[PDB]
CSV table of C-alpha atoms and ligand atoms in Angstrom, one decimal:
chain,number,residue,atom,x,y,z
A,28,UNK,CA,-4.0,-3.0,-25.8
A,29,UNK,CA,-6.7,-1.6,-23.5
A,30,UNK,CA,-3.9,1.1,-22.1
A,31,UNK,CA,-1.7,-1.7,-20.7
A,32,UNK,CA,2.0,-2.0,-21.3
A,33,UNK,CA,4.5,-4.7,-19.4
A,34,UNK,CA,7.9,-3.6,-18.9
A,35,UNK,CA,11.3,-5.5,-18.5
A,36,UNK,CA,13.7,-4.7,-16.3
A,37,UNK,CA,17.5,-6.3,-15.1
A,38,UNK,CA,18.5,-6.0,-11.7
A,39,UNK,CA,22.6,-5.8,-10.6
A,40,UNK,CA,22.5,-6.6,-6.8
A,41,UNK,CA,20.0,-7.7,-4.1
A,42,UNK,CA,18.5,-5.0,-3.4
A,43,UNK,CA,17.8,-2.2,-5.9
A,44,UNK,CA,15.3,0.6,-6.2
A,45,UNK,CA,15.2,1.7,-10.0
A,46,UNK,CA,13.5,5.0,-11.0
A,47,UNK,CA,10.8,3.8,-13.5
A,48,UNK,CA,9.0,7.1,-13.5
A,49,UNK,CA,10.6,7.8,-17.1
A,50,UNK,CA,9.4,5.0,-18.3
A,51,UNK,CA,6.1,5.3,-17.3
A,52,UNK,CA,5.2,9.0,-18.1
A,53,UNK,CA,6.6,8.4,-21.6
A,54,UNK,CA,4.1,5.6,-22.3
A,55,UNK,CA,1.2,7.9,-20.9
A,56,UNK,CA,2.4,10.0,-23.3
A,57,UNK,CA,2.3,7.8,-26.4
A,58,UNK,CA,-1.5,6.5,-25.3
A,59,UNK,CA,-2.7,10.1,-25.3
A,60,UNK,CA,-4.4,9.6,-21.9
A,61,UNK,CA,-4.8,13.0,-20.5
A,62,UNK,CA,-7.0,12.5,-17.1
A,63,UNK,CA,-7.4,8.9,-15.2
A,64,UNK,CA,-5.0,6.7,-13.4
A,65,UNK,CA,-2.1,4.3,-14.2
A,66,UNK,CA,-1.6,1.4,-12.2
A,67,UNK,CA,1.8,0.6,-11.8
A,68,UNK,CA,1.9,-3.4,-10.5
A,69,UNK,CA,5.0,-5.4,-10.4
A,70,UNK,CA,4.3,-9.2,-11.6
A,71,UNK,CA,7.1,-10.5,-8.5
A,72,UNK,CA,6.1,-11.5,-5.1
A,73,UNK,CA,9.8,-10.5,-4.4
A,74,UNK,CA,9.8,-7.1,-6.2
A,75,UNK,CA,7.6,-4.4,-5.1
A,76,UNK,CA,6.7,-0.5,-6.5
A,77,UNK,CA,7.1,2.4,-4.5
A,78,UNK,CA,6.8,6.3,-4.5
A,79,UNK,CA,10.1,8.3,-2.9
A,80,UNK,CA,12.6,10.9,-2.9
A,81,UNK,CA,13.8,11.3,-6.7
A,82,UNK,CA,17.0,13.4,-6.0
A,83,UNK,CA,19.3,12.2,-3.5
A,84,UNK,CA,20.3,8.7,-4.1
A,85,UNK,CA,21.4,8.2,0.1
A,86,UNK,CA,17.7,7.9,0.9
A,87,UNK,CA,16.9,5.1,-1.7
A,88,UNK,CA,20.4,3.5,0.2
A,89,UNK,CA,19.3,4.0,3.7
A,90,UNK,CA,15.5,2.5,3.0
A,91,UNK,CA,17.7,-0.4,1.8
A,92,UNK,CA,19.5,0.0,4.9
A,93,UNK,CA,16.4,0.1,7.4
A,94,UNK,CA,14.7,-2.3,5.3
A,95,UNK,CA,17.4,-5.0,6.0
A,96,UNK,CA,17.4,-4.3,9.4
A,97,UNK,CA,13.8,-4.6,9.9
A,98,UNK,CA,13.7,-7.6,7.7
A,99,UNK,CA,17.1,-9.8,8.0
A,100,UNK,CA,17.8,-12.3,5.0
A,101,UNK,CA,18.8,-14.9,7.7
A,102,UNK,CA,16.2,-16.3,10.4
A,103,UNK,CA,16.5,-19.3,12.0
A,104,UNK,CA,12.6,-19.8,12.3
A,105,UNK,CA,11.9,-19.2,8.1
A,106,UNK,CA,10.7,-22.3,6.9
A,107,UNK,CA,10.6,-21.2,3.1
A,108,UNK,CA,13.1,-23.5,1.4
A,109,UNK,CA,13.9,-21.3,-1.1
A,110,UNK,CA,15.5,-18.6,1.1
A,111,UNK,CA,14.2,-15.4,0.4
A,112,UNK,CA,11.7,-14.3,2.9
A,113,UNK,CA,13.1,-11.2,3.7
A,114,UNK,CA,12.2,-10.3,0.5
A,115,UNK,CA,8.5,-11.3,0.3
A,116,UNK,CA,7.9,-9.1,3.4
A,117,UNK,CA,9.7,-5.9,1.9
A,118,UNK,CA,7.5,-6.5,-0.9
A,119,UNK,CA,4.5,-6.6,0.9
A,120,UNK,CA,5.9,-3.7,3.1
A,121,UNK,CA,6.0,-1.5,0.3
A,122,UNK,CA,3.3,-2.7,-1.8
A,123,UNK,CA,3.6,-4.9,-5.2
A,124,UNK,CA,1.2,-1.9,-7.0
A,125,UNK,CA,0.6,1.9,-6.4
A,126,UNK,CA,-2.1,4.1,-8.1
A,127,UNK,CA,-1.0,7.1,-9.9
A,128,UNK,CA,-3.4,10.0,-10.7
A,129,UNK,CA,-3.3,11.2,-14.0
A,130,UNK,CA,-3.6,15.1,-14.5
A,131,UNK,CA,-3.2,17.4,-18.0
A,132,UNK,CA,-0.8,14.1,-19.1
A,133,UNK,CA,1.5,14.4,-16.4
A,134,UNK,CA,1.9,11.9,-13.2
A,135,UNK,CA,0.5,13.5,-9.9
A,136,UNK,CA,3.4,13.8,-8.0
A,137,UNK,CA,4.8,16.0,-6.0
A,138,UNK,CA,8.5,17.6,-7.0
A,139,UNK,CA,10.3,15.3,-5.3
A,140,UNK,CA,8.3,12.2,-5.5
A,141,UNK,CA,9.1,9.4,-8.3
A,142,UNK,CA,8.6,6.3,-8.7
A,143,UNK,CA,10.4,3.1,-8.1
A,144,UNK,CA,10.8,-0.5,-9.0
A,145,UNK,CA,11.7,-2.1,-5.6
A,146,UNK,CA,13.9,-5.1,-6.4
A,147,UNK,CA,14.8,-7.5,-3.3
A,148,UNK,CA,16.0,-10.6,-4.1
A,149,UNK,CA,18.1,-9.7,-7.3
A,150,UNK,CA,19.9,-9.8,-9.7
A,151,UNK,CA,17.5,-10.7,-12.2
A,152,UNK,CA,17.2,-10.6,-15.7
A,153,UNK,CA,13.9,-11.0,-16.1
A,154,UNK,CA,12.1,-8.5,-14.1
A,155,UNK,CA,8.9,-7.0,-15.4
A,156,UNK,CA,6.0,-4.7,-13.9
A,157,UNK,CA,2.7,-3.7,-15.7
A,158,UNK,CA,1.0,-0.7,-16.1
A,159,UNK,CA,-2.5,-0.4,-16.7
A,160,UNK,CA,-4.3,3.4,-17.6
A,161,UNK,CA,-8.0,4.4,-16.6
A,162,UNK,CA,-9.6,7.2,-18.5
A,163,UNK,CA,-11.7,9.8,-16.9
B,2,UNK,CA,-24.5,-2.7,-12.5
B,3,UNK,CA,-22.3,-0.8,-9.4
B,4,UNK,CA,-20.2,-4.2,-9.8
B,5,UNK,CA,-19.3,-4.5,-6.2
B,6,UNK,CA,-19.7,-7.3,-4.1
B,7,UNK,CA,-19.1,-8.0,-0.5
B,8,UNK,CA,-17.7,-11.4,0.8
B,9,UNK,CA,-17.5,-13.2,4.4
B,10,UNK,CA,-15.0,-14.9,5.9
B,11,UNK,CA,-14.5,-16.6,9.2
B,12,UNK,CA,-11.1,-16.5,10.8
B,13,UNK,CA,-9.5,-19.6,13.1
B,14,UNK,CA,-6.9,-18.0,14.5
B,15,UNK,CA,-5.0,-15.1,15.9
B,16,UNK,CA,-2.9,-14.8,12.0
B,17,UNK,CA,-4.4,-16.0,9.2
B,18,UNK,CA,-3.4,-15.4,5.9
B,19,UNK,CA,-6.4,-16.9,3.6
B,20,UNK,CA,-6.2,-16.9,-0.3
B,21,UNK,CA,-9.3,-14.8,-1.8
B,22,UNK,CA,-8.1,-15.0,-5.4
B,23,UNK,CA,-10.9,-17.7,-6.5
B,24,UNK,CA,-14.1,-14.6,-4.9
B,25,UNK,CA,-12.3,-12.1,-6.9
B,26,UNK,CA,-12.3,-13.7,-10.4
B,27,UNK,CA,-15.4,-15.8,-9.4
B,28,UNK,CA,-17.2,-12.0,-9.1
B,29,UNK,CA,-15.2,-10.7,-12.7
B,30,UNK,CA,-16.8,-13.8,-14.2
B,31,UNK,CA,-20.3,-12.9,-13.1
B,32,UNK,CA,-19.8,-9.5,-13.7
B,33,UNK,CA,-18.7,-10.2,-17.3
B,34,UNK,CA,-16.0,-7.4,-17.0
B,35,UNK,CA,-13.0,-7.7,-19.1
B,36,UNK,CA,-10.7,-5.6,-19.0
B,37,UNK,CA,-10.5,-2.8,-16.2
B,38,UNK,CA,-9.4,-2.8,-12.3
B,39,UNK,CA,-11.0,-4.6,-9.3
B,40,UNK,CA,-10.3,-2.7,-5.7
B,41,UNK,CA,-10.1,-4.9,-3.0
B,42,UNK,CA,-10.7,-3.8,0.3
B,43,UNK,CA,-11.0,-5.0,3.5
B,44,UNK,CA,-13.5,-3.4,6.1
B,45,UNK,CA,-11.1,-3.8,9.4
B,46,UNK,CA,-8.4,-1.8,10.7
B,47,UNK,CA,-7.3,-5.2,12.1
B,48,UNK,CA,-7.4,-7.5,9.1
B,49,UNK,CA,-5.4,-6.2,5.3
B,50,UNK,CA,-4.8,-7.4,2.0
B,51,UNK,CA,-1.7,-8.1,0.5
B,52,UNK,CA,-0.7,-10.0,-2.7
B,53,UNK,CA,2.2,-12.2,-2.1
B,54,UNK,CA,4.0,-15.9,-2.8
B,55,UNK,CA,0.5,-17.9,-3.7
B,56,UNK,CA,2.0,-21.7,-3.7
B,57,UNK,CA,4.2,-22.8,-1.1
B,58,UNK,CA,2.4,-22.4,2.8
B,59,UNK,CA,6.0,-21.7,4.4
B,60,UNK,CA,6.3,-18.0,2.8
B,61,UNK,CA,2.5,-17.0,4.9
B,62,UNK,CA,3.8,-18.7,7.9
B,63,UNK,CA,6.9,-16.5,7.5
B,64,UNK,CA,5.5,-13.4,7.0
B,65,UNK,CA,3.5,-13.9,10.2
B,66,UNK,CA,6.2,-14.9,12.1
B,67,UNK,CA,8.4,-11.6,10.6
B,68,UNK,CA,5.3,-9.2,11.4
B,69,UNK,CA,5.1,-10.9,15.0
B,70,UNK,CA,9.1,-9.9,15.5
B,71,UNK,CA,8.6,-6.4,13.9
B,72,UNK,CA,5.1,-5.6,15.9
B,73,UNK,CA,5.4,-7.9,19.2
B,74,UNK,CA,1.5,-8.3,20.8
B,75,UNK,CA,2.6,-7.2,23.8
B,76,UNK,CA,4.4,-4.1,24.4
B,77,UNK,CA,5.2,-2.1,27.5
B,78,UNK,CA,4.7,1.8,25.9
B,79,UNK,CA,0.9,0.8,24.2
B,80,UNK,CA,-1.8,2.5,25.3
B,81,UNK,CA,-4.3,1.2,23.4
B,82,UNK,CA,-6.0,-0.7,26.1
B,83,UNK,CA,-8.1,-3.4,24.3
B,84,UNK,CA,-4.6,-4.9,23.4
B,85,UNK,CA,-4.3,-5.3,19.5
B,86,UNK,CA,-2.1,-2.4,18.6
B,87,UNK,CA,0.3,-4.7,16.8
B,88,UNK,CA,-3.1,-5.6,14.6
B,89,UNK,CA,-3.1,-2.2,13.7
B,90,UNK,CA,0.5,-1.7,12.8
B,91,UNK,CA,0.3,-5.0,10.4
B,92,UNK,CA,-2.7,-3.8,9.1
B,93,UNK,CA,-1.4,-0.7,8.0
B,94,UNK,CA,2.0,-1.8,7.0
B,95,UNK,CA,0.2,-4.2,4.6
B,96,UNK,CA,-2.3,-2.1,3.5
B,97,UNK,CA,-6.5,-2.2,4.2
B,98,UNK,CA,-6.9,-2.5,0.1
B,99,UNK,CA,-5.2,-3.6,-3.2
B,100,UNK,CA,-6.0,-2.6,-6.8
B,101,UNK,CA,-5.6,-5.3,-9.2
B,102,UNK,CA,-5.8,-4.9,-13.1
B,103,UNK,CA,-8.2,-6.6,-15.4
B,104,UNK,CA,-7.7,-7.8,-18.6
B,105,UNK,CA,-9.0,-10.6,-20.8
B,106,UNK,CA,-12.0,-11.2,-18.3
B,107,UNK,CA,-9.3,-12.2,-15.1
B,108,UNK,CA,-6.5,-10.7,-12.6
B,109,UNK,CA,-3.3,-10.0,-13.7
B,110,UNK,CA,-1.3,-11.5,-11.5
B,111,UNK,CA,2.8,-12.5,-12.1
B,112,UNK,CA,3.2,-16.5,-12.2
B,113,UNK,CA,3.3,-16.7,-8.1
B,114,UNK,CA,0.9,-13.8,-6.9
B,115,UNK,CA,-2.4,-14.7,-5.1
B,116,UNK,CA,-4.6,-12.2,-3.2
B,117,UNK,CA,-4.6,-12.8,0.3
B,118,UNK,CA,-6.7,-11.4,3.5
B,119,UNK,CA,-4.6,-10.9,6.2
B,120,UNK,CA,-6.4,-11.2,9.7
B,121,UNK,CA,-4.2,-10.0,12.4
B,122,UNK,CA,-6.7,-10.3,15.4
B,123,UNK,CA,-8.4,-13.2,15.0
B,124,UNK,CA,-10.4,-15.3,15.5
B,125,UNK,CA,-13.6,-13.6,14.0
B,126,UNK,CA,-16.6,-14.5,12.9
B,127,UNK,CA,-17.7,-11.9,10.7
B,128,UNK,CA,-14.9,-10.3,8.6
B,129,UNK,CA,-15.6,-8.8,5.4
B,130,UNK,CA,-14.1,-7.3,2.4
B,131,UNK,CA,-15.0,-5.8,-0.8
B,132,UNK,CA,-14.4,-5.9,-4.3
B,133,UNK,CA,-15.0,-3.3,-6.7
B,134,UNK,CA,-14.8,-3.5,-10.3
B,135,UNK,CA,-14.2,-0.5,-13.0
B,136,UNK,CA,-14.5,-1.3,-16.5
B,137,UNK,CA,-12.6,0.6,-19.3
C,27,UNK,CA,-11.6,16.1,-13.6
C,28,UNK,CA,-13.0,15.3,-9.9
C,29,UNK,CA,-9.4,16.1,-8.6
C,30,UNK,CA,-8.9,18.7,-5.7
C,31,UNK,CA,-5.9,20.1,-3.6
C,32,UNK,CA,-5.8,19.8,0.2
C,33,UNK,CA,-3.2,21.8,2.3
C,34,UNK,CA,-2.8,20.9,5.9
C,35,UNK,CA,-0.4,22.4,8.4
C,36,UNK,CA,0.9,19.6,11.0
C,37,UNK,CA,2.1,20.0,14.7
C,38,UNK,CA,4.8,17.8,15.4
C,39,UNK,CA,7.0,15.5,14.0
C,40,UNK,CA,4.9,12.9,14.1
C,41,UNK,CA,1.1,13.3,13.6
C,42,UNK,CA,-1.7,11.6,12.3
C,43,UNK,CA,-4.6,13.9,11.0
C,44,UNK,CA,-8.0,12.3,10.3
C,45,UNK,CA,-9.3,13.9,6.7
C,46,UNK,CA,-12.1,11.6,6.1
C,47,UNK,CA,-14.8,14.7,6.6
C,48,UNK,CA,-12.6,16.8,4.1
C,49,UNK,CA,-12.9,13.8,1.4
C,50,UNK,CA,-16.4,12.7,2.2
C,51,UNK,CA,-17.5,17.0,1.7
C,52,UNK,CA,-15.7,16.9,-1.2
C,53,UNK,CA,-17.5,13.7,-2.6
C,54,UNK,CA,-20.9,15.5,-2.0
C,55,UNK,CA,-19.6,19.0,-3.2
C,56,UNK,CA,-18.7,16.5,-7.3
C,57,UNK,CA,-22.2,14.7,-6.8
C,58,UNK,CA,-20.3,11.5,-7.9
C,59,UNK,CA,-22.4,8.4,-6.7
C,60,UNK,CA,-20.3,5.6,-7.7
C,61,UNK,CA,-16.6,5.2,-8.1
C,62,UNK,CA,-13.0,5.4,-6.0
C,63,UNK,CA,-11.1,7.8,-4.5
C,64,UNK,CA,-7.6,8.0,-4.9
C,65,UNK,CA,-6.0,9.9,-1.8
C,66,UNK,CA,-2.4,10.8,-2.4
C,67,UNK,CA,0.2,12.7,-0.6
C,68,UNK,CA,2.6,14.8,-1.8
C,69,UNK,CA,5.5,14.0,0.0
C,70,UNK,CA,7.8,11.6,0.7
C,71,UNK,CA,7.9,12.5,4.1
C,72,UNK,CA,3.7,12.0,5.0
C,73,UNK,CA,1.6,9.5,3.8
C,74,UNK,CA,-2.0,8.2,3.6
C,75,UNK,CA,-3.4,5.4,5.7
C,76,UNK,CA,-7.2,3.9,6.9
C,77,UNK,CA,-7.0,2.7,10.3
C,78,UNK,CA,-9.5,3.2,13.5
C,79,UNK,CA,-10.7,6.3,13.8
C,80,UNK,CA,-12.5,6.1,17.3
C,81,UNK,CA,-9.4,5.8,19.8
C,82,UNK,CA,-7.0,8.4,19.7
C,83,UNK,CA,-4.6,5.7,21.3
C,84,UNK,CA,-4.5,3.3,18.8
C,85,UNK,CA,-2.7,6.5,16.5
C,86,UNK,CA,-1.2,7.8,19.3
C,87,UNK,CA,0.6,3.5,19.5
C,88,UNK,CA,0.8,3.6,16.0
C,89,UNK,CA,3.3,6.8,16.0
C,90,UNK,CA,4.9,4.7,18.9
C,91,UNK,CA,5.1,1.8,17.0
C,92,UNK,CA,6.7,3.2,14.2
C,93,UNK,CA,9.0,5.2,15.9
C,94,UNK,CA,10.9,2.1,17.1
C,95,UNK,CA,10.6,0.0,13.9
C,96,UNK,CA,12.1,3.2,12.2
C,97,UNK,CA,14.6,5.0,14.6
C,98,UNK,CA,15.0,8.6,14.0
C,99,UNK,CA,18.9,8.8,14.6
C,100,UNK,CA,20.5,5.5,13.5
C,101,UNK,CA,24.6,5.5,13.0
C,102,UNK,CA,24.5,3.9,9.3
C,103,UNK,CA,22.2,6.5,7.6
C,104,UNK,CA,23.7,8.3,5.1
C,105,UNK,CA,21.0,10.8,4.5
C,106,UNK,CA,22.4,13.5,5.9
C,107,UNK,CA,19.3,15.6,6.3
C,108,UNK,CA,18.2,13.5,8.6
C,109,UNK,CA,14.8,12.1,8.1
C,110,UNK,CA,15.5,9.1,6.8
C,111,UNK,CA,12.8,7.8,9.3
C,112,UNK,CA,10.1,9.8,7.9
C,113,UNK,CA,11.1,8.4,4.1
C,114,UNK,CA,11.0,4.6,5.6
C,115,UNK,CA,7.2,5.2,7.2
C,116,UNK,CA,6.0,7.0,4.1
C,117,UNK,CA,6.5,4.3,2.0
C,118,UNK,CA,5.3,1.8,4.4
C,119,UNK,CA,2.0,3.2,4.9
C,120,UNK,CA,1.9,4.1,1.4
C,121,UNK,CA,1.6,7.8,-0.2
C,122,UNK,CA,-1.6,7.2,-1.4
C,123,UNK,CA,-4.7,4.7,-0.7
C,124,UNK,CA,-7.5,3.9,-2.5
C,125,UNK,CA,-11.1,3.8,-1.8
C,126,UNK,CA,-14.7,2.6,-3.0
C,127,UNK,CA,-17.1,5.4,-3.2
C,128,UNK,CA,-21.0,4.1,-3.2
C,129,UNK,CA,-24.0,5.8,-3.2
C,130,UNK,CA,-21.8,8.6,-2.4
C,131,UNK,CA,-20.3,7.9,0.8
C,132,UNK,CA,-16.8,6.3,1.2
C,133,UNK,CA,-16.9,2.5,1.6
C,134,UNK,CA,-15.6,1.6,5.2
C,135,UNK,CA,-16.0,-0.3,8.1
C,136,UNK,CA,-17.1,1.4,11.3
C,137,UNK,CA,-14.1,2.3,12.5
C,138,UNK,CA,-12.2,3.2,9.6
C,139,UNK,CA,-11.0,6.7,8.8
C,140,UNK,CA,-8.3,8.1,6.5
C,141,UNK,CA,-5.3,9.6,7.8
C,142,UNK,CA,-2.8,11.8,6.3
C,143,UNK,CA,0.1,10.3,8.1
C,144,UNK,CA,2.8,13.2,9.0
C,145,UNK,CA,6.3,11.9,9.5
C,146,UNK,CA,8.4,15.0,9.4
C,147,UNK,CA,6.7,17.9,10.8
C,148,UNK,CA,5.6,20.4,12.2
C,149,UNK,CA,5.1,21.9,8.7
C,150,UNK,CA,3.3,24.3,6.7
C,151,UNK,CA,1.2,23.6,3.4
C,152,UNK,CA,1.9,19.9,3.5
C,153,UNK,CA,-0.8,18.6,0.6
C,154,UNK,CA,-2.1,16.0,-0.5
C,155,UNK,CA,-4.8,15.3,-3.7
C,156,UNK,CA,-8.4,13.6,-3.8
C,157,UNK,CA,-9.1,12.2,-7.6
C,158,UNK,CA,-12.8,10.5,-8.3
C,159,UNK,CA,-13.1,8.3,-10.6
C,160,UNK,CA,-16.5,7.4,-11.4
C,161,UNK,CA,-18.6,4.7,-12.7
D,9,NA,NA1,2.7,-0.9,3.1
């Protein structure tokens, strides 16, 4: 398996920013990588993966917030047929991948910082993100 | 090997968003790496690289046009003389670089993703980016 | 494990702090030749970006720039701490960015630096972590 793993995910509304930190560490975990890097990549060009406040559930809601601001679904110069625009930009705005550094077996992440699967143009049943481990 | 390559491109226009998928996986094949990650960075603070919507032209066009709205060209607080702040601002909103994963001797990628260089103050004649690859 | 702490203390709310030197010294410091960098931040209020590293206007625009994308008092926020702004830019710059290390220098253009990108300052012991990975 070469330390990679795909994941599956289903998404209830639009927009949704899942806490896949869990699911990540625990798979670390059953590799036995101890030192390296996992990189976490989302196979959607309308779901992206982001690092952010793991506590208080009103700042994942207000990115959502400013994000739909920044990006509106509706614009009456998108050409893209099938709609979703706003969602390939919030993807690329956040990033489809990060790069987690791997310490003593545990994510390098500050105490408030997790990690998210960054759905835009949900639901869907059959999201899925990858994550790849480097050994030191 | 150090496995890293550097590739040109020329740019036509002010935005460009040009597919650089094929140079990547062209320079795995030569490389004969199989599984592992390829970094892909760009050497500009004015020109990125994103993954995003690799099939249908409309979803670039819209993404420039969205950047445009979010960072107008001109704009009356700027400072930055030379005139290309908003270049900046996409650039770093995008990102400079993107780590791809390896595996089976090509990019995995989700069913729609390419790897695109985003010029945001074109034209240019001499743009570059860089792909690294680490092996398992 | 090539991995090393950084602590910073930041000036305002909004600053961005070149720490290229502080990697590159570090770099030289491992002897690692060939590889990446991974530069992450701790927070989810500062993060990590490469952008030009010669005009202090083009940060001093960027700040600017971001400031009106991401308004710091907007009526619908429900974050009631109140830096709601800092949490958008974070994760639009990124918390962490990578980089090519070769023949033991960082891989970038002439005018790229790295930034730690503080969105919620002034603060004390802000940090943010260097891993190598080499070749
Ligand atoms: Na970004």
């Amino acid at each position: 398996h070469h330390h990679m793993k795909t994941f599956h995910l289903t998404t209830q509304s639009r927009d949704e920013m899942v806490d896949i930190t869990s699911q990540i560490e625990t798979w670390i975990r059953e590799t036995g990588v101890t030192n390296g890097v996992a990189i976490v990549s989302s196979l959607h060009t309308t779901a992206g993966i982001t690092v952010n406040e793991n506590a208080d559930p009103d700042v994942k809601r207000d990115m959502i917030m400013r994000l739909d601001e920044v990006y509106p679904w509706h614009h009456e110069n998108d050409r893209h047929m099938e709609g979703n625009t706003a969602a390939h930009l919030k993807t690329s705005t956040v990033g489809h991948a990060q790069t987690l550094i791997i310490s003593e077996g545990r994510l390098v992440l500050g105490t408030w910082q997790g990690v998210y699967f960054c759905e835009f143009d949900g639901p869907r049943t059959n999201r899925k993100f990858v994550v790849k481990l480097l050994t030191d």
